[model samples]
Target: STGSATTTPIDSLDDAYITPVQIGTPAQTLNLDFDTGSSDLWVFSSETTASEVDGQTIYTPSKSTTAKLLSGATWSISYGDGSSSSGDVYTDTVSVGGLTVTGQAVESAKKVSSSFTEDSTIDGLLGLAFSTLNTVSPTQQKTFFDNAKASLDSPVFTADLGYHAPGTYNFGFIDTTAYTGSITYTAVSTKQGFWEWTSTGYAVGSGTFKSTSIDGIADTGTTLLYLPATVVSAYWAQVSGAKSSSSVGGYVFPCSATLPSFTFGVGSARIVIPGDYIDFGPISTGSSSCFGGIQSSAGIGINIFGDVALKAAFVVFNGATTPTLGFASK
Candidate 1:
């Protein structure tokens, strides 16, 4: 069996990717952020306070005959900025693309953070990371992928993100046409509850390859690429006016500056990020200074290869028991 879904960019900035997933007996559709950084499929539901709900869609489990409350189950997902959401759990028919999972855990959010309430397009998040990161208490729940993988032709999924456009998330079989050349596979460390892998090295523009094993998580949930300060500085140094700005936060430079491309190695395979992708658009509405997509991971506990990097290549999250990640140029 196989499944495929379209992933649309939420905002002009490509802040997140949204996928339509059907839930409940009547098939209520909600736009969910398919995040590879976490493991918790949560949604805005009737349980949420009316005051907190904005223009976002809500999942009402009461209307579904197949919906059954997971007694004593509770979940809470907390972030670094003190934002969080917690609620009880329910099991219902969940479908993504054409693949269906019976009695899938559908966590209903009772309370949401102010930031989540402000976002109107994203109703909730669909975690694609390992089940070890699930926030459900008493008993951890399996992700949609985990539940569907058994019936799938292969236990692997692919992410092909586009720049300011819609891409495809494929499950089971890999579409060989989506990428060019051969794919390079690397080992993943599930201990951190992420599609965590190490890059063989990196190169700035046409510069020599810096043979350093850069450890990072392939995080689709995040917006930008975060690396060690040493590597980040090297990339920015090539730009005429680039600097680490405390005011703007992270590296920023004049919008007119010519930004150099970034490249990272997956084994011997090198994937290049176009210069335009790193020039993360203007800082403000009319500001001439632009924010960089590649930033330092100094204070951040781990480095992240986010959307900026993901868009440059096709990524495969192979969920076999060994769990390996594959990268290819598209």
Candidate 2:
């Protein structure tokens, strides 16, 4: 089986890529943020407390004959940003693009953080990471990608994240026409939860490649690119007056400053993110200071190659017996 979906950006900077997901019997369709960094297929739904749900679509399993409550099964996810969501589970028929999965664990949110409660572009989230990262208690569940891998024509899925335009996510096959360069495959540590891989260092603009090995995860769910303090400071230092501000929560620079393109190595191939891509937006509405899309992950525990980096290339999450990650210039 093969599946595909259009990934739409909610903002100008592509903070998250959301796609349509059909759940349950009568098919309650909801736009979901697809997250390779997480492993739970959770949603804000009818199960969500009335007071907690603000402005968004809700999944009502009561109307779907295919929905079945998973007795005693509950799940909770705490995000790295210090927010969390908890809910119960339901087995239901779920479909995306042209593929379908029966008895898929559909986590329903009973409670979510304030950020999720208020009006946002996404209705929920669908995880694409390994099953080991699932937070379901009593009965852990597999991710949508994990469950559908065997049935897919090829045990692989690809991500084409866009910089400004809309992108697409495909299952079981690659869209050959989307990208322009040959893919460089690399070792992936599938034993762990996240899609852990190594990068062959980075270069700022026309500068020399660092030639150092850096380990990180390709997190489509995360909004910004986070690297070691040394790598981050090196890039920021090139721009005049750019500095990491504790008060602003990240590296900030002048909005009109000359920004340099950033590049990271994947074997001999280098994926370049335009200078404009690194400058997300002004720190505050109508302000002259802008927050950078790249930040230091020093104390965050894990270096994250988030959407800012992922949108620069075509990525393949190969689900072979010995999994590997594929990257190519687009």
Candidate 3:
């Protein structure tokens, strides 16, 4: 069977993509961030203290007679940005885009970091990464895609993330009409529990495309593209009045400056990121300065092709014996 879902940007912050998913027998719908970076289907729940939850929606297990507690099981996860959550586990029916996975492991949050609690709109996270990265203890949990893949027409999903607009997430089948030109397929190494691949090279602006051989992961959960320090410095140099800001905590430049386009090489196929896309909105509302979408991924080790980079192209997360990634211009 084939399934699909529509995704949209958060109104206040265009940082991530949000999609709706249903849980339990009665189907309590919640807006979740479809994150490819990490693997864990977690949600705010009744277990959370009322004060701990702001305007966010919570999943109540008691409402669903089909919800079964995974007794004594607990889960906790901390992100690279230091956001964290911990909670108990339950087995329930979870549905995404009409694809239902019965007895799926759903983590119900009892506590959350300030970052999560403050994001009033996002109800939870739906990880689309490999099941190997799932944090459920004792017995690992499988992602919704993992659980539903066996019965799907094809074990594949496409991420059509848009800039300040709504996009679609197609599952089990690829929508040939959603993209333009031929799709360039690249091999993926899931050893790191990510859709990691080696980029042949990249270039800043219209400059010479260098053969730097950068290894990075395609992460939808992240907001910006992260590269090596040298690469980041090179791109900033192309812009006028750009500098590393200690106060803003990243490279900031005048919003009006003409930014340079970035290109990434995938198996000889080059994907060009538009200059305007490089400007990741403003540093703050009504601020004249903007943060560079591409930043230094020094300590992070692997470069992250986040939403900023992913938005420029149509991405297919193909799950074969050896997973692959297909990119095409939209």
Candidate 4:
């Protein structure tokens, strides 16, 4: 059956939006970040070592009668930001909104990196990328969406990530009411287990649009937009007080800077991110310095259109055919 769920931003943290998900029999509910970047459904759990556990709400598999261990199966994942987790596997019924998937692989964390253990707000992560990216060894596991898609009406989902507000995730069908204007569809390359695409070009402020094919992944899990170092430097050059801060690890500017808007070309569509949105708030409390929402993807080699870019538009992740991506203004 088709279903949808609303996602709410964690207060003060525009990094990611979380939705409630139910797992196992009797339904143990938890708030999970639907990450399109990685492919693993892992959570803080009773299985985690006490030293690694902090303020996160752990999922107790023993509490669910339907939970079954997939003996000898395990998973480990590390993100670009260096966050990581390793866990044993369990098969359970997982449900999101009105959609239900039986025999879903649930990774219960036994160890987590300091990044995860410190930020207790995220109970877990639900991977929305290709199932082939699933970390379960011996047999790669399928995501809840992968398993549930066959039973869905259209095998599509829409992400309406709002700024400091609640947004909706529609599954199985696209909701026309959530977006405005016609959606521009683009081909996605699945060679890399990601929703990867190429933007034709980009522009800084009112400058002429430069022709450059940028290959990158649309990662909701990443908080900032990352592009090539040269492109990043060029954009900051247009800002009066912008400077590359080694201490901040990226570009920083005065909080009061009247930054210019950044625009990216997606086929014939132009997606523009307003200047203020790129401000990324202040670097610290009582400080005039602010970190840039856009940073260089140097060393990583792949640009990432993270929340800073995605939130500016309504995105449709179409898995039905050639995995096309549809974008429209919010």
- lDDT (C-alpha) at residue 117 in model 2: 80
Task: Note the clash tally of each candidate.
Answer: 0, 0, 0, 0
- Candidate 4 overall lDDT versus native: 0.88
Over 1-330, each residue of candidate 4 has an lDDT whose tens digit, in order, gives 787888878766587788888888899888898998888998889999999888888889999999999999999999998889999999998988888899999999999999888877788999999998999998899988899888999988888888878888888998888888888988899999999999888999899899899999888888889999989999999988899998888899988889898998889888888887687778888889988998999998799999888888889999976898888886
Query: To one decimal, what is the Cα RMSD in angstroms of model 2 from the true structure?
Result: 0.9
Q: Estimate each model's TM-score.
A: 0.98, 0.98, 0.97, 0.97
What residue runs in model 3 are displaced by over 4 Å at the alpha carbon? none
Candidate 2 structure quality by residue, lDDT tens digits, 1-330: 999999999888687878999999899998899999899999999989889887788899999999999999999999887778999999999998978999999999999998788646788899998889999999899999988999999999999998888889999998889888788999989766889999998999889998888899989999899999999999999999899999999999999898999999887778898898898888889999999988999899999999999999999999898888999889
Model 3 per-residue lDDT tens digits across residues 128-205: 889999999988899988988898899999999988899988889989999898889998999989999888888988
Alpha carbon lDDT of each predicted model: 0.92, 0.91, 0.90, 0.88
Which pairs of residues clash in candidate 4, taking residues 3 or more apart in a chain or in different chains? none
Q: Output the TM-score of candidate 4.
A: 0.97
CA error at residue 316 for candidate 3, angstroms: 0.8
The clash tally of candidate 3 reads 0
Predictions: Cα RMSD each: 1.0, 0.9, 1.2, 1.2
In terms of TM-score, how similar is model 2 to the real structure? 0.98
Give the top-scoring candidate (lDDT). Answer: 1
Q: Write the per-residue lDDT of candidate 1 for residues 1-330, one digit (tens) a residue.
A: 888999999988788899999999799999998889988999999999889999999999999989999999999998644678999999999888888899889999999999999999999999999998999999999999989889999999999998889998999989999999998999999998999999998999999998999999998888899999999999999999999999888899999998889999999889999898887888999999999999999998899999999989999999998999999999
Better of 2 and 4 by TM-score: 2
